[PDB]
Structure formats: structure tokens, C-alpha cells
């Protein structure tokens, strides 16, 4: 689990993994489904 986003000064996560718009980083459908996403929407 990672902070992105305003939650993280403006950070950014890496690939294979999905930015939640509330600034948090993860996986699975939970975080990288269409509803949440809003940074790095492209993870495993």
C-alpha cells in the first residue's frame, strides 16, 4: 500500500499498479476498476 497523488505531494506510483483519485496507490480490480482511477490506469 502507497500514498499518490495530493496524498503524496504530487508523487507518482510505477507501473503494474493503479493511483486511486484519493491519492491511493494499489491493486486489484478494487483500486484499478473504472470508478476510483485516477492516476497510473494501466496497472496489473
Do not use: E, I, T, V
Not at 497523488?5 to 484499478?32: I, M, T, W
Amino acid at each position: 500500500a502507497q500514498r499518490c497523488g495530493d496524498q503524496a505531494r504530487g508523487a507518482k506510483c510505477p507501473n503494474c499498479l493503479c493511483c486511486g483519485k484519493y491519492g491511493f496507490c494499489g491493486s486489484g480490480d478494487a483500486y484499478c476498476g473504472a470508478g476510483s482511477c485516477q492516476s497510473q490506469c494501466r496497472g496489473c
